[PDB]
Amino acid sequence: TVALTVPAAALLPDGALGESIVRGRRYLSDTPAQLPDFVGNGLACRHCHPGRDGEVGTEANAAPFVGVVGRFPQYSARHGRLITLEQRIGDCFERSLNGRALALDHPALIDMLAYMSWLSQGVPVGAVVAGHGIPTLTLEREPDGVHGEALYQARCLACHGADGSGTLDADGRYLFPPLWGPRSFNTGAGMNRQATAAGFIKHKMSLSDEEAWDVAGFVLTHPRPLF
Template sequence: MKRNLAAAVLIGLVGAGMAHAQSLQGLPAGPLGQSIQSGYDMMMHTTTNPEVKRYVGNDLTCSNCHINGGNTAAPGNFRETATELPNYSKRENTVITLEDRIANCFMRSMNGIRPSTDSKVIVDMTAYIDWLDRGKPIETPPAPPSKPSPYPAMLRTATHADVVAGAAVYKTNCAACHGATGAGTPGTFPPVWGDKSYNAGAGLANPVKLATWVKGNMPLGNPHLTEQEAFQVAMYIDTHPRPDFVLSKHLPANAPADEYNASVRAETDSVASNFKKAGLSLQSLTGAAN
């Protein structure tokens, strides 16, 4: 593969983080339009926006994963999000709303504190995502994909060789932007592992979800990684250290019990436990057991 991937592999985790928020066109007049614009601005400048940065615990912005503020057709887009919620969430073991889904992302992908679902942050982000889905019917549950994902089967049979191959993909195509240590470049390219990246409770900490994202988005503007390459680089990234997720540490202190809409009230995730759930040993995958 060519080095042109280096400027893009792994994320609106890349160029999307550099984009400047702009004035959206066709907004309704008055407070609703202002709320939609505010939600978009928060998506694009999550770590610096004064309303939202207090809830963030790492160096990611929403637009790192949701390229162009989620206004694309690629994995991670918001164009079909509002119409799929409310819906049942296995993780929370309850029916969640769009507001819940956004607030929960702050605990996981942003490694921060969960905002109240009636806070300005969640209301404005919800208004923006709803606006992207304007005019579409609510469809719950969403239709199954036309083609089953190959990645669950790949994960079940993954070995150390996949991680080694992923390291080669990363070195050739990703390290120029995200660095050999995965730390990224502050304000330009986000970290893909380590203390300032998403924690072990985030969706992208699952190589199946990360591979799906990578395959559909990278390289930015011209995604052409093979399914195997996308999976292997996802394995390489997700076997690296990142913050553990302990649910209780990400809920605001003294919040009412019903503020967090979930039947699951305790959860702890780590890199090792994530792979254990898939029947895999982190030590074996990284070669530490050899």
């Protein structure tokens, strides 16, 4: 593997590419507001792909975009064939954002690609970046949603809400995003999978493996949009 490095925003190039990258960052950070025709819920890409200092997709073990462009095209079992990064992003819009895929030459899609390529600068094509993806967490027992509920009330509720509906900021963006219900990810999303949610929760928080497993279980007992 190669190390995860975040390029310096002050070294962004003048011109069309620099401008595109800046637009791309905003599409990823503010998706429902910027692309209402394509987003069906309250989630922005950054809600599962966080980054510090205004960037998106720069956190190890929270599916960073650093180095993602050199890993496509790649096989998808879902599609039964090779897919491009453009297509992967489309699946995210359809599942995680409960919406509609952007046309494969849509300027907003190309701006997102430009941003991801910027984050990937210096990464050799084919190389795997340390911290890529969301590492699954699987336990050898059923998740205990009763324990999970207690854990949720103690550790999660103050941000994500008694009803999982999250907390809106002053401008109507989710400060704390919804975990279930009609504004959350739909059943087709990767986050709807127990081991992926447990893994995400484990790495993005102070929780033991058993606690992340049980609280993920509790979260995923709830309704959400059907895909």
